[PDB]
RNA sequence: UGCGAAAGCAGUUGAAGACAAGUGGCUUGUCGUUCGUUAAUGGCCU
């Protein structure tokens, strides 16, 4: 009865290609400016910008139509690419979508009520692995294709011609070049510029594509003055830039933060000069006035030119990596920001904003994982540092060779994220780097985002040496499985180059929320509990036995556990009683367990479970002696004590499992874990790994790299579902790609996640006036 | 600090300028009026320009380039051409 | 019939515009809630009625955009440093300007405003202009659709108010100025198609305190045209 | 986008404007207006003395009585007033005009020691001299009352009614003995008596079920539907004198009942939880005649406190044209009878200061001035340096300056590491300086006059802090 | 008062054709009822409609406008098709067709036959000793062109071809304004400024009934087979009376009532009703031009009856972008602790002593660096 | 860079190609180069 349906979205997928791009935005509008067509990994995404909502998906499973295009296994790099109007092929003659994504694969997609599941799955003839981008006019559609050094691929224009044989689009074959290190296109598209490295020195072109209007090119050690002659590569690199729509204006936004603009006739040099970090994101308006600049600071700024002043914008949370304006007349900006808070995954953050306020309308996120490491060509943005955000210019080649060949010659990937779902409405919590994501999966979507901390995560855009003020980083928060408290504990520190700058040092508190509100009120806070200095890493809530999820007792890696309970007479949190022994020897690898009528409390240390009881928190020594063992010892270091119901019990180590039964005190059964699983975890992450059922167990899920024929780019989720303490293998589902956690919804289902971010589940006449006067209607 | 352009007949403002962000003292050009050079007590000589075709068309001035290479103040510049000095 | 009769006011009537083609007046005054009416010979109701807090508007009026006509944007604003525009749809939408990008000190008051539009003249975008009033010679001219500052023009002397004169250059073509004012009474009549520069300038003979311009005849604010060629 | 972050006995000591005004004698007891207590009356010796709750002194003032008086009592409307003396001639006359004499009757010729109205009836006046026998005179024919309620051991003293039931009468006489008549009865047995020990100072009902009595060093609790006591109270120096009840005020504790027990603190217990105090403030002395104001006394109410040397303490809380006009008349209205209602206001916040704008804008050189002068609170300066060490960077925020500037973090880091939690964070914060400015007291060799002070302040500190953690080692001993 | 000037449904009551005044000119617009916005404009205020009747059968209205013109409007093609002029420049009254032959009757108190399969006049004709008249009914005997019935201030009978008066009926006091034949021998009269509907037959002429309502009628529908007569009043309630044709032996009196109200304490008053079988359709000015409307289901509603309608009243208007307070929902929330109780997890000397190893490093770090 | 713990424990620290500069040639420093080792007065509004 159970069977894999992955359902949920994942990441908006931008043009994820290092300098091979000048725009990496293709969320379109449609010609009347009222829904937003927006790729993602998973769906494409419609919506209604008066009311932020989606009308219509086209989900990326739902047709074997589109999806084999992507669904492979290893080649899930089909990424989308651009997205035009009208339907190509008849000229222009009503209104569904066309649809390219990274391989050249010309879609024609539905737009409005209910599909035709007849897609024009058209393809033009050379578009074998390739596709920068189209650019589009009237009439004349211009493909920018790659071809292969020094690490520079080689850019073509080439014309779809398509005039009376209906079935064959041909190229025409306008242009060549074989150098290219940045490159931007108009916001019209009817003008691009690139860069060739062709040495007496590097050198800029601007070419037009659809006449023989403009095409020119100049070396750049002419914009690069003395200053820039003689300073250091920070300010001699081109960061990001942008051409207007006219043909007269080009700005080059530095490295360093400066904005050069240069005009195409007499070559002046322009130079504006707020930003104090690298620059990302550089647009003209449409009548060429405005510059709409945003880079690692916070805010959107964008200047007069005719003032060379400027307009702000001043908490984005996050950082600005494309903008531009889009409106026809051009009252939209669409934008996308990143917040790098996590250096883990590209989180990015796709967005708009009216130009009227600067309010912004549909935020489109995707889920923001909280892994442990980069994930698969996990690049990091060009700033003057190699950060603990980002690497520097100069380690482009170094950082994406120390991450490619860590994945191949490492052995330690887990990146096991830890989440939350919430007892009132079912979504789940993606606990931030001091904040939070509550993901409503049911339609894919967020509904706040809460900052966790007093840090400096808000109020101050990160700069070039704040960037190693990390903000202090939670570990997880307990729910109140009544759906009442946040209680959340979390690490921080400080920066480096201080005596106090040593110890990492722990806080934990308390939200409470009604089920009108969003967010969460404080309602208490306790530093470091257990005295100062000791981590609180294992906390557990408890069931509706006591006081309806008031228990919570924290615990350590040394060994202490304290006992929380909520009151109202003192109309706060605090303890109820107290244990700390106090080994000179630590050990962070420790599970807990609990009953779920109230009876036992399960210490699972470094290779030992120790019991004691609820009552007297103490190891219960009663006045028989007869099998009352309250002290069991494991076969070595374990991760995982769970409890599925009172009665019997898994326990999991590096090496094996292991069934326990306690009323019957014994042990059960037991199966191989170190056959799955070489050295890919951490101590401790078996915990966040599995979760039981309240019934059924628990699914164990298979820990797999698939080999080079080290491991390729290729993985794995071939998981089998257990049922009632280690007894059958009931279900091996089979999939190729990788997995971080699965949890148990109420429904008796199992969630997993996937790291391409995609979330599923295993689970159980007078009718022809009528119509006449509706088409007069408009 | 407001460098204001004013055009000479109709008597009227033409552009104005308050990047300058002290009292502005003096102020020089070229011969033909491609540039114009201020500074004042911000110790700040900056540039603004009118040397493009769209610049000499509609009469526009932008603000070019600003440096800052002094200690206190500025209290006179002045500016000279040749074709064997500039 | 009395055209408040239906729904009255209660403050005075500091603004009254028609809308360009649609049989609609518009009433705004100081209790800051602007009214709308059907108005006819017999019997004349009130469609709707924004009301709208703290912000007690003085002047307000319809605007259609030349090109697609299908706009219907209010905008309305008062003594404060805020102005609001809608686009009316028959629950509102409205929006609140108040990003002043180039001149920000200039404004203790957005209360005097018109709206123009005008050509690209190197395309054909056909767009809204606000203008509104400063203080001491300061006319800035906006976007009506995004809200950029385009630009402002300063005259010589207090401004006491202004209008907006266009003109037709070809089948399709066409040239807006604004006219300004002083309380002496020279007035500055520049173009602003392009740069917002003075091309004509005289005197009024006499006025010690002038104190309202109107243009008229063709078209103006209150007689808007409605295809480019119709100006 | 976004905005920007930021970063019960209250109530019965918000009681101020605590004036005294010292009598001649002492003050036996006092009253209260009881339909609007804005007035109120002491029982001076010979003379009563009535004043309002806004000049907080005499308003008016009756003086010829020719002996010391006892009690001073308002009828339930409100319009006159009793006395009794220690001649025993009690006298009635109308409140709000002191000169006039309604009717002076003699009661038995023991001291009329008190007299007080019916709660509710306006014709019925109960009177106790030193007879051992009460009266329940009748104000319409004061030549005999209706009832000669004896039945008494010894010097019926305290009298009261039970305020919903008509016919009980609970006297207090210096026996214990609280016994509480019948009217319909025949005066000479109560239906039961409450056991007190001593002597009852003043009996008062609190309920219509639950009356408190006091007499002693404790006082007691008694239920009169089940002749039973669930409550004493007895920490006090001596007796508790008076007695005060009030129902339905503005605080955190609903209703309240006060204690005053010659030994300067009043006592504010509380039937909601059983009578515990929220906090009792002192007097100058031997507190006999403590109440605050009823209920109605609508915001402005006064607590008084005649002591037995005679001072009162009065503590008081207390919460262009028209053409132009026509031009601006449309400023109230707000949208009532028409359509659709706009809001979109930003709100005028908490006033921020200058030290948090220069953590806003970066302004740290400014920000450290503004938090080391005198004129900003000690624990602002705290926090500012707490969390501006967790916001940014110390060396940047110290790149360029000297030791006069350094001086005031010094002077009060002086002071601040004798702090509990921000002790060793200052401690860090002259870490750093010293840390990276050693070349400048090698250069200005003044500021180690400061160093060696603190030197010496922090060697007396580091001993405290030692000796302190082995007390509480041996608390950890002898555990 | 009523913005619309006239209005009228089309046969089987799903469209509604009606005139209102915009700045000083008419203009006609159609509206289904279950937007539509092709407002056939007027030219001048000098031509107003009069009176309007649809055809069934491509589908158009017919207007008799105040000068001597019926415009054959079509309705998809939004224009008049044809004009069927006059010779006289007089004000029509009323228009009603049968088939392919319609009959106009002017103030010069002619008779006009059209036909509007081929677009002629065919006669022409006044008579004697009918002066003021308003309007007619052609009487429906299956292909009964003759005997058509005419009404003003007394109401009289015509034969064609005769062309004589045959039959005269006590009218009203008033001029009529609603004449309705609803079975093949009775006849609706109503009066304007008058209470009192009357049937009458149309051999005997002796009135069966006088319908009394509570206000001044302005329109009415019938069932096709006279079985439930609803009527609109002038104040803008409705009387719907069931059977009015069987026996209040003489005066039948209101039946069942509707208003509509809103849950404001508002009556909007409704106006122009339609009934077929167990169905009926009200119509009322939502906002100060717009017709809506609403399909009641007639036989089981009570006998008083108020419709509750939605109307903007107060509502607060809300973005599709802003919390209560007025924040970007497109963003995070912001961090705050409010007033929490702050407390270390201990519960002084110990919290004293936890950092005094932390204090003796500071303090021996102070010491070593005063040294240094 | 690896393990591990808020801890110590082991190593990279290469080469080629091309360019820049000082002196055809040599000498000093780099690389939005293939390969290997786990190793710029420019700062946040209404």
Redesign the interface.
């Known amino acids: 009865q159970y069977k894999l349906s992955v359902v949920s979205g994942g990441k908006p997928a931008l043009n994820n290609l290092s300098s091979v791009t000048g725009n990496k935005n293709i969320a379109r509008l449609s010609q009347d400016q009222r829904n937003y067509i927006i790729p993602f990994n998973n769906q494409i995404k419609v919506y209604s910008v008066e009311t932020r909502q989606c009308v219509k998906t086209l989900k990326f499973a739902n047709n074997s139509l589109l999806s084999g295009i992507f669904l492979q296994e290893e080649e899930n790099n089909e990424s989308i690419v651009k997205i035009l109007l009208g339907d190509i092929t008849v000229p222009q003659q009503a209104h569904l979508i066309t649809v390219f994504t990274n391989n050249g694969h010309v879609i024609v997609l539905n737009y409005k009520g209910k599909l035709v599941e007849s897609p024009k799955h058209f393809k033009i003839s050379l578009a074998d692995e390739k596709l920068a981008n189209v650019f589009h006019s009237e009439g004349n559609y211009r493909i920018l294709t790659t071809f292969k050094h020094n690490s520079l691929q080689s850019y073509r224009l080439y014309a779809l011609t398509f005039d009376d044989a209906k079935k064959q689009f041909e190229v025409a074959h306008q242009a060549e070049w074989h150098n290219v290190i940045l490159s931007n296109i108009s916001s019209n598209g009817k003008l691009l510029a690139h860069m060739c490295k062709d040495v007496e020195h590097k050198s800029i072109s601007v070419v037009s594509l659809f006449d023989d209007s403009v095409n020119l090119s100049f070396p750049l050690g002419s914009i690069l003055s003395s200053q820039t002659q003689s300073l250091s590569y920070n300010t001699r690199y081109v960061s990001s830039m942008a051409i207007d729509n006219m043909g007269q204006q080009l700005a080059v936004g530095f490295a360093s933060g400066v904005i050069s603009i240069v005009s195409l006739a007499d070559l002046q040099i322009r130079l504006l000069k707020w930003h104090i970090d690298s620059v990302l994101s550089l647009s003209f308006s449409h009548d060429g006035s405005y510059l709409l600049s945003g880079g690692w600071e916070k805010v959107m700024s964008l200047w007069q030119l005719e003032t060379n002043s400027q307009q702000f914008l001043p908490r984005l949370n996050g950082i600005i990596i494309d903008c531009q304006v889009l409106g026809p007349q051009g009252n939209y900006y669409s934008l996308i920001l990143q917040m790098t808070e996590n250096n883990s995954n590209s989180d990015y953050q796709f967005l708009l904003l009216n130009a009227s306020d600067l309010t912004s309308k549909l935020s489109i996120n995707g889920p923001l994982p909280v892994f442990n490491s980069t994930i698969k060509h996990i690049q990091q943005p060009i700033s003057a540092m190699n950060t603990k955000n980002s690497n520097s210019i100069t380690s482009l080649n170094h950082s994406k060779k120390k991450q490619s060949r860590k994945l191949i010659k490492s052995r330690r990937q887990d990146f096991t994220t830890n989440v939350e779902i919430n007892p009132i409405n079912k979504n789940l919590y993606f606990p931030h780097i001091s904040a939070v994501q509550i993901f409503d999966f049911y339609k894919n979507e967020q509904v706040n985002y809460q900052y966790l901390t007093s840090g400096v995560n808000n109020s101050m855009g990160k700069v070039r040496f704040e960037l190693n003020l990390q903000d202090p980083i939670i570990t997880d928060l307990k729910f109140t499985k009544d759906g009442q408290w946040m209680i959340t504990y979390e690490i921080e520190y400080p920066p480096n180059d201080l005596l106090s700058s040593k110890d990492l040092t722990h806080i934990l508190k308390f939200w409470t929320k009604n089920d009108n509100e969003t967010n969460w009120n404080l309602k208490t806070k306790v530093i470091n509990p257990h005295g100062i200095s000791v981590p609180i890493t294992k906390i557990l809530p408890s069931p509706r036995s006591v006081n309806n999820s008031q228990g919570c007792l924290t615990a350590d890696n040394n060994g202490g556990l304290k006992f929380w309970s909520f009151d109202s007479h003192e109309s706060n949190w605090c303890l109820k009683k107290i244990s700390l022994p106090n080994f000179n020897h630590f050990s962070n690898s420790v599970s807990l367990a609990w009953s779920q009528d109230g009876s036992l409390i399960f210490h699972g240390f470094d290779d030992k479970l120790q019991i004691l009881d609820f009552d007297t928190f103490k190891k219960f020594e009663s006045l028989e002696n007869t099998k009352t063992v309250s002290e069991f010892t494991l076969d070595s270091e374990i991760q995982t004590v769970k409890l599925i119901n009172d009665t019997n019990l898994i326990v999991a180590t590096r090496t094996t499992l292991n069934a326990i039964n306690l009323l019957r005190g014994q042990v059960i059964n037991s199966f191989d874990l170190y056959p799955f699983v070489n050295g890919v975890y951490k101590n401790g992450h078996m915990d966040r790994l599995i979760t039981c059922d309240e019934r059924t167990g628990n699914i164990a899920l298979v820990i797999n790299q698939q080999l080079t024929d080290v491991p390729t780019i290729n993985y794995k989720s071939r998981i089998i579902i257990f049922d009632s303490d280690l007894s059958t293998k009931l279900g091996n589902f089979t999939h190729h790609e990788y997995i971080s956690w699965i949890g148990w919804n109420y429904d008796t289902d199992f969630i997993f996640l996937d790291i391409e971010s995609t979330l599923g589940v295993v689970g159980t006449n007078s009718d022809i006036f009528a119509e006449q006067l509706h088409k007069l209607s408009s | 600090g407001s460098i204001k352009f004013w055009?000479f007949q109709?008597?009227?403002?033409?552009?104005?300028?308050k990047?300058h962000d002290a009292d502005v003292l003096c102020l020089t050009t070229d011969t033909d009026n491609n540039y114009v050079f201020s500074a004042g007590v911000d110790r700040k000589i900056f540039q603004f320009?009118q040397?493009?075709?769209?610049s000499q068309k509609?009469?526009?001035w932008?603000?070019?380039?600003?440096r800052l290479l002094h200690g206190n103040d500025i209290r006179a510049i002045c500016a000279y051409q040749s074709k064997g000095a500039d | 019939k009395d055209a408040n009769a239906s729904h009255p006011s209660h403050s005075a009537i500091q603004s009254l515009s028609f809308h360009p083609s649609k049989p609609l007046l518009l009433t705004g005054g100081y209790d800051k809630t602007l009214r709308i009416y059907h108005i006819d010979g017999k019997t004349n109701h009130l469609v709707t009625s924004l009301h709208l807090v703290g912000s007690p508007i003085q002047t307000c009026t319809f605007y259609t955009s030349l090109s697609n006509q299908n706009q219907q944007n209010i905008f309305t604003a008062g003594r404060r440093r805020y102005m609001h525009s809608w686009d009316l749809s028959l629950t509102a939408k409205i929006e609140k300007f108040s990003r002043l990008y180039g001149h920000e000190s200039t404004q203790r008051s957005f209360e005097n405003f018109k709206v123009a539009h005008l050509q690209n003249s190197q395309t054909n975008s056909v767009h809204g202009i606000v203008l509104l009033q400063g203080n001491n010679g300061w006319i800035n001219i906006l976007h009506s659709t995004s809200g950029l500052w385009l630009m402002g023009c300063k005259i010589e002397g207090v401004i006491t108010d202004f209008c907006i004169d266009y003109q037709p250059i070809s089948r399709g073509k066409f040239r807006t100025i604004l006219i300004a004012v002083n309380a002496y009474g020279e007035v500055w009549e520049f173009d602003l198609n392009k740069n917002g520069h003075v091309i004509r300038r005289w005197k009024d003979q006499g006025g010690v305190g002038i104190t309202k311009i109107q243009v008229g005849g063709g078209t103006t604010t209150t007689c808007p045209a409605l295809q480019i060629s119709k100006i | 986008s976004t905005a920007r972050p930021r970063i019960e006995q209250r109530y019965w000591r918000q009681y101020t404007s605590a004036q005294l005004v010292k009598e001649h004698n002492s003050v036996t007891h006092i009253s209260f207006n009881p339909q609007h207590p804005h007035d109120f009356a002491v029982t001076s010796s010979t003379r009563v003395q009535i004043f309002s709750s806004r000049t907080r002194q005499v308003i008016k003032t009756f003086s010829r009585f020719k002996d010391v008086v006892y009690s001073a009592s308002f009828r339930s409307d409100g319009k006159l007033l009793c006395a009794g003396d220690a001649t025993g001639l009690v006298s009635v006359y109308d409140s709000y005009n002191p000169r006039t004499i309604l009717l002076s009757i003699n009661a038995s010729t023991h001291p009329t020691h008190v007299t007080k109205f019916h709660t509710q009836d306006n014709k019925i006046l109960a009177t106790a001299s030193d007879d051992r026998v009460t009266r329940l005179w009748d104000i319409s024919n004061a030549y005999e009352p209706q009832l000669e309620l004896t039945g008494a051991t010894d010097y019926v003293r305290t009298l009261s009614f039970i305020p919903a039931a008509p016919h009980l009468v609970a006297t207090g006489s210096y026996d214990g003995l609280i016994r509480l008549y019948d009217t319909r009865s025949s005066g000479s047995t109560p239906i039961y008596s409450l056991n007190h020990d001593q002597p009852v100072e003043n009996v008062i009902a609190v309920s219509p079920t639950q009356i408190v009595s006091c007499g002693g060093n404790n006082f007691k609790v008694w239920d009169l539907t089940s002749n039973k006591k669930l409550y004493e109270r007895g920490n006090f120096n001596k007796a508790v004198t008076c007695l005060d009840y009030v129902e339905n005020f503005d605080s955190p504790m609903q209703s309240a009942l006060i204690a005053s027990s010659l030994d300067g603190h009043v006592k504010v217990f509380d039937p909601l939880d059983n009578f515990q105090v929220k906090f009792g403030w002192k007097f100058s002395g031997p507190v006999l005649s403590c109440a605050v104001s009823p209920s109605t006394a609508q915001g402005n109410r006064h607590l008084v406190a005649g002591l037995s040397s005679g001072l009162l303490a009065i503590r008081t809380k207390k919460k262009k044209s028209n053409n132009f006009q026509r031009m601006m008349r449309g400023s109230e209205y707000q949208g009532d009878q028409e359509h659709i209602i706009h809001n979109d206001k930003v709100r005028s916040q908490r006033r921020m200061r200058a030290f948090e704008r220069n953590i806003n804008q970066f302004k740290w050189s400014e920000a450290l001035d503004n938090a080391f002068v005198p004129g900003m609170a000690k624990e602002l300066t705290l926090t500012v340096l707490q969390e501006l060490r967790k916001r940014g960077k110390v060396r940047v925020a110290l790149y360029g300056r000297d030791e006069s500037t350094l001086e005031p973090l010094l002077n009060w880091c002086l002071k601040g590491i004798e702090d509990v939690r921000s002790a060793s964070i200052v401690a860090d914060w002259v870490a750093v300086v010293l840390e990276l400015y050693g070349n400048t007291l090698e250069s200005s060799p003044v500021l180690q006059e400061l160093m060696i002070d603190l030197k010496t302040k922090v060697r007396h500190e580091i001993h405290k802090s030692k000796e302190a953690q082995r007390i509480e080692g041996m608390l950890q001993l002898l555990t | 008062d009523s913005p619309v000037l006239q209005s009228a449904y089309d046969p089987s009551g799903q469209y509604l054709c009606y005139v209102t005044v915009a700045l000083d000119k008419q203009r006609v617009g159609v509206q289904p009822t279950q937007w539509n916005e092709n407002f056939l404009y007027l030219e001048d205020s000098k031509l107003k409609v009069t009176c309007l009747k649809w055809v069934n059968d491509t589908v158009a209205i017919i207007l008799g406008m105040n000068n001597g013109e019926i415009w054959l409007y079509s309705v998809l093609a939004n224009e008049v098709t044809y004009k069927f002029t006059t010779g006289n420049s007089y004000e029509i009254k009323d228009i009603d067709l049968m088939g392919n032959q319609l009959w106009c009757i002017d103030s010069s108190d002619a008779f006009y036959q059209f036909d509007l399969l081929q677009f002629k006049l065919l006669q022409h004709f006044r008579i004697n000793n009918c002066v003021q008249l308003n309007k007619l009914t052609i009487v429906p005997a299956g292909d009964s062109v003759a005997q058509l019935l005419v009404a003003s201030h007394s109401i009289s009978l015509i034969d064609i071809e005769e062309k004589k008066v045959v039959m005269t009926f006590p009218g009203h006091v008033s001029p009529v304004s609603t004449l309705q034949v609803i079975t093949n021998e009775f006849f609706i009269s109503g009066a304007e400024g008058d209470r009192f509907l009357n049937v009458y037959d149309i051999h005997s002429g002796m009135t069966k009934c006088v319908l009394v309502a509570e206000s001044d009628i302005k329109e009415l529908s019938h069932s096709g087979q006279a079985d439930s007569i609803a009527v609109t009043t002038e104040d803008g309630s409705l009387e719907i009376f069931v059977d009015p044709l069987v026996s209040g032996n003489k005066s039948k009196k209101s039946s069942k009532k509707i208003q509509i109200v809103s849950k404001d304490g508002r009556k909007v008053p409704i106006y122009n009703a339609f009934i077929n079988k167990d169905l009926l359709n009200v119509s009322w000015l939502q906002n100060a031009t717009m017709p809506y409307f609403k399909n009641l289901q007639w036989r089981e509603i009570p006998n008083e009856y108020t419709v509750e309608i939605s109307l903007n009243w107060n509502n607060k208007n809300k973005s599709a972008d802003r919390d209560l307070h007025g924040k970007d929902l497109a963003s995070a929330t912001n961090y705050v602790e409010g007033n929490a109780r702050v407390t270390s997890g201990d519960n002084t000397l110990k919290r004293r002593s936890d950092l005094l190893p932390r204090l003796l490093a500071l303090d021996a770090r102070l010491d070593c660096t005063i040294n240094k």
């Open positions: 055009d109709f008597a009227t403002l033409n552009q104005s300028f990047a320009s040397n493009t075709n769209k509609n009469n526009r932008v603000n070019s380039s600003n």
